Amino acid sequence: QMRLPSADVYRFAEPDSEENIIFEENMQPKAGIPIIKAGTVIKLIERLTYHMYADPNFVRTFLTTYRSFCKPQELLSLIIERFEIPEPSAELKRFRKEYIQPVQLRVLNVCRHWVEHHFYDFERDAYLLQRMEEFIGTVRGKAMKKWVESITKIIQRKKIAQSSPPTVEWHISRPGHIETFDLLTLHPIEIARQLTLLESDLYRAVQPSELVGSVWTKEDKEINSPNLLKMIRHTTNLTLWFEKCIVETENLEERVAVVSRIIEILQVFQELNNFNGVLEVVSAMNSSPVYRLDHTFEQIPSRQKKILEEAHELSEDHYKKYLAKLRSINPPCVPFFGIYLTNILKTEEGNPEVLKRHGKELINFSKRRKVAEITGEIQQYQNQPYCLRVESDIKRFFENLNPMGNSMEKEFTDYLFNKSLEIEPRNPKPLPRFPKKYSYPLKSPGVRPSNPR
Amino acid sequence: HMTEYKLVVVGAGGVGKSALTIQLIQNHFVDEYDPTIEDSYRKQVVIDGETCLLDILDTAGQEEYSAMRDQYMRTGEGFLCVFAINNTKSFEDIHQYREQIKRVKDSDDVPMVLVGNKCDLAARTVESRQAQDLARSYGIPYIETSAKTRQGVEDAFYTLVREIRQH
Ligand SMILES: *[C@@H]1C(=O)N(CC)C(=O)[C@H]1c1cccc(C(N)=O)c1
């Protein structure tokens, strides 16, 4: 075994014990490396830059989740400290080849991975980047040169900042006639495709920095989780817009046509694996103003009722069927984000930040790994896009929807509910009749494409 | 077959409401929680000698999906309306949650409990008398709990089960 310096001259030389590092029973499934359960920051930074082997998964996890237990400025200090190794002949020649070069190389891998995949720490603190460039400048060596250059090229780059898709579908509204666009005038296939494209881009824009530390639930959520929130607000807007379309169609025949068309949009969302789209529709249908419209759902064809029940069933038993179905499909898809949010929050709130062993505090790294597993799953669905053509006018129409207008939430949701009670009064009030509002035909063009690909 | 009660946790985000259910399910001497599994939200319990199963829905973290509340709430037979005793706004939000529960269930008598949760050692801004008065205006029980010590957690949930049984 190698003779390392004293802990008084080099902190990372201190040996492993029950007081500074602990492990899980299992090993990395594909790498055979032990799984760290907890440790001190010193021991975690030692194992992040371990001399015996490279640990890419641990680097991945650490760099995603360390901010809950160590500041960016403190991590940079601890990795520069790790690189500055003092000596404790044949013993020295082995030390320099089996301890110093591997460790120094692993520190540089951390630096590289940090500037590449978590550059926001540097964007948010210019002094952190000043120090990183300073450190990288002092690095000298033949083995180092190649990695020092790569890092410098990433920093400067970061500082600078398929086949034919299907034909676009049109129904009553024609290309460019943006003034006539509505739920029944636009083609139901194209509504679903264009909403799937918006919702996919909204999904792909959410980063782990908006999720780690449950920051979207905290007072600075608007600063720290802007892409997640835009995504949730689009979803909410579309649910509300669907409800608005329904209850503002006072004529029963026209309302049946409206509900039926939304169920067709749902069917296309199912085809495209847009589960966010699916649940937007299901949420609208199970809302207080829509759910009670028994005279409307009575006239809905059985095939559309069945489509709606299967979609509703995905959410039952704590998303049991949704969870199975998402696992069974391959990208492109648009997952429902809410489950991930709940799982990250509960993982973080339901587990301790620190574990105590022989009265010594150890950072609970396994809690952080569990969170990084959820962020990795989010990311696995963000890599693959859809092979659908954007229609810029239909896109702009859904981006600019604003069913609420200037009304507050309570005001608007009470207006929707009072509209529901007006169009279909509560028993034993008889059902009134209402005039038609649509001067165009109510018949759908269906969900099968009009022409061949 | 033993009776199963579908319970729903409703309340403001950002105030650690998830502690109530986490502390119920996780054994009184274990802290290693995994929300990904079925045992994380189901628990067989004995209440007044009658064995039952509590299935608890807590959507903590999905507050911004405001249009999904009705859908989530309609799954419940009983509701735990939770606020944090250090956050007055979360206490003031209760009136609308209850109104929404009543609308969703289409009933003025829905089994429900008011839960005042002490999530940390930050200063109390909601006095027990205020919440005791609010709970009496609605005709429901008030239970106060601690996220640190587990004090009041069983009582909050068991009081709800009793409200469903006596409905
Ligand atoms: C407890 C509380 O009352 N407030 C308002 C001051 C909180 O922010 C809340 C809190 C929030 C998240 C988590 C936790 C926790 N550790 O239980 C507490």
The resolution, in Å, is 2.5
Q: Whose CA is nearest to atom 7 of ligand 1?
A: B15
Region for residue B128 given its phi and psi (left: phi exceeds 0; alpha: psi -120 to 50; beta: otherwise): alpha
Q: How far apart are CA A149 and CA A131, in angstroms?
A: 16
- Give me the sheet containing B78-84, strands edge to edge: B42-47, B50-58, B3-11, B78-84, B112-118, B142-146
CA distance A64 to chain B (A): 19
Q: How far is CA A158 from CA A62, A105, A141, A154, in A?
A: 21, 22, 25, 6
Judged by CB atoms closer than 8 Å, whether chains meet at B13 and A343 is answered as no
What is the best residue among B18, B91, B120 to mutate for testing ligand 1's pocket, by most ligand atoms within 8 Å of CB? Answer: B120
Instruction: Tell me, yes or no, if B108 comes closer than 8 A to chain A by beta carbon.
Output: no
Q: What angle in degrees, to the nearest 10, is found between the helix axes of A252-271 and A226-247?
A: 150
- Nearest-by-CA chain A residue for B38: A318
Farthest-apart Cα atoms in chain A, separation: 101
Domain ranges of chain A: 3-159+338-380, 166-337+381-450
Contact A292, A243 (CB under 8 A): no
Whether B62 sits inside 8 A of A315 (CB atoms) is no
CATH of A3-159+338-380, one of 3.90.1300.10, 3.30.1340.30, 1.20.870.10, 3.10.180.10: 1.20.870.10
Cβ distance B66 to A284 less than 8 Å, yes or no, reads no
Round to whole Å and give the CA distance between B87 and B91: 7
Q: What is the DSSP letter of A9?
A: T
**Pocket (CB within 6 angstroms of ligand 1):** A 349; B 14-16, 19, 84, 86-87, 119-120, 122, 147
CA A134 to mean position of chain CA atoms: 34
Asked whether the beta carbons of A358 and A367 are under 8 A apart, the reply is: no
Q: What does the block give as tokens for A234?
A: 């689009």
The chain B residue lying nearest A214, using CA atoms, is: B61
Instruction: Say yes or no: do domains A3-159+338-380 and A166-337+381-450 share a fold.
Output: no
Q: Please give the interface size between A and B, counted as residue pairs whose CB atoms are below 8 Å apart.
A: 99
Quick check: A371 and A174 in contact, CB under 8 A?
no
Span from the CA of A369 to the centroid of ligand 1 (angstroms): 23
CA angle A163, A164, A169 (to 5 degrees): 150
Are B86 and B144 in contact by the 8 Å Cβ rule? The answer is no
**How many residues are recorded in chain B?**
167
- Give the residue, out of B33, B63, B119, with the most ligand 1 atoms within 8 A of its beta carbon, to mutate for a pocket test: B119
H or E, element range at A287: none
* A92 Cα distance to chain centroid: 49
SS3 of B58, please?
A: strand
Pocket test for ligand 1, best of A219, A221, A345, A349 (most atoms within 8 A of CB): A349
Q: Among residues B45, B7, B28, which one has the least CA distance to residue B148? A: B28
Query: From the list B34, B35, B61, which residue is nearest A217 (CB)?
Result: B61
The pair of structure tokens assigned to A354 is 């620190």
Residue B49 has which token pair? Answer: 């000698």
Backbone angles phi, psi at B52, to 5 degrees: -150, 175
Lookup result for tokens 């569990």: A370
Which domains can be identified in chain B, with CATH numbers? Answer: 1-167 (3.40.50.300)
Residue B47 bridge partners (DSSP): B50
Longest dimension (CA), chain B: 46
Tell whether B6 is within 8 A of chain A (Cβ): no
* DSSP letter, residue A212: G
Token code pair at residue B138:
């609605």
Distance, CA of A221 to CA of B14 (rounded, Å): 10
- Cβ(A412)–Cβ(A404) below 8 Å: yes
**DSSP tally for chain A: helices H, then strands E:** 21, 4
Please give the full DSSP string across A322-382, using - where no structure is assigned.
HHHHHHH--SS-B--SHHHHHHHHHHHHSS-SEEEETTEEEEEHHHHHHHHHHHHHHHHTS
Residue of B nearest to A352 (CA): B31
Residue A393 to residues A90, A175, A296, A400, Cα–Cα distance (Å): 73, 8, 31, 11
Sign for the CA dihedral angle at B97, B101, B107, B110 comes to negative
CB atoms within 10 A of CB A196: 23
Q: Which residues of B touch A316 (CB under 8 A)?
A: 75
* Ligand 1 atom closest to Cα of residue B122: 6
Cβ atoms A107, A82 nearer than 8 A: yes
Binding residue numbers of B = 14-19, 30-36, 60-61, 117-120, 146-148
Contact across the interface for B22 and A235, Cβ inside 8 Å = no
Question: Angle formed by the axes of helices A56-65 and A41-48, to 10°?
Answer: 140
Taking the CA atoms of chain B, what radius of gyration do you get in angstroms? Answer: 15
Q: What angle do CA A363, A368, A370 make, to 5 degrees?
A: 135
Give the HSE-up count for residue A163: Cα atoms under 13 Å, Cβ half-sphere: 2
**Which of A335, A371, A60 lies closest to A211 in space, CA to CA?**
A371
Give the number of other Cβ atoms within 10 Å of residue A218's Cβ.
13
Phi-psi region of B14 (alpha: psi -120 to 50; beta: other; left: phi over 0): left
Does the CA dihedral A276-A282-A284-A286 come out positive or negative?
negative
| Helix H or strand E encompassing A23 | strand A21-27
Among the partner-chain residues A217, A232, A316, the one whose CB lies closest to the CB of B65 is A232
| DSSP 8-state code for residue A96 | I
The 3-state DSSP class for residue A24 equals strand
A37 in Cβ contact with A365 (< 8 Å) = yes
Question: CB within 8 A of A183, min separation 6: which ones?
Answer: A191, A245, A258, A261, A262
| Displacement of CA A408 from its chain's centroid (Å) | 28
Q: Kindly give, in sequence order, each residue whose CB lies less than 8 Å from that of residue A115, ignoring residues fewer than 6 positions away.
A: A122, A132, A151, A154, A155, A158
Which tokens hold the place of B120? 């940390």
**Helix and strand tally (H, E) in chain B?**
6, 6
* B80 Cα distance to chain centroid: 3
User: Prior bond to A332 cis, omega within 30?
Assistant: yes
Domain A166-337+381-450 has CATH 3.20.20.480: no
The answer to whether the beta carbons of residues B53 and B4 sit under 8 Å apart is: yes
Q: A162-165: long-range contacts (C-beta < 8 A, 24 or more apart)? A: A162/A387, A163/A387, A164/A453, A165/A387, A165/A388, A165/A389
End-to-end CA distance of chain B: 21
**What is the full DSSP assignment across A107-172?**
HHHHHHHHHHH-THHHHS-HHHHHHHHHHHHH---HHHHHHHHHHHHHHHHHHH---PPPPPP-SS
- Provide the 8-state DSSP code for A253: H
Give the burial string for A245-268 (b: 16+ CB within 10 Å, else e).
bbbebbbbebbbbbbbbbbbbbbb
CA angle at residue A416 from A273 to A262, to 5 degrees? 30
- Cβ distance of A346 and B60 shorter than 8 Å: yes
Q: Which helix (H) or strand (E) holds B33?
A: none
Dist CA A426 CA A418 (whole Å): 11
**Residue B14 gets which letter from DSSP?**
S
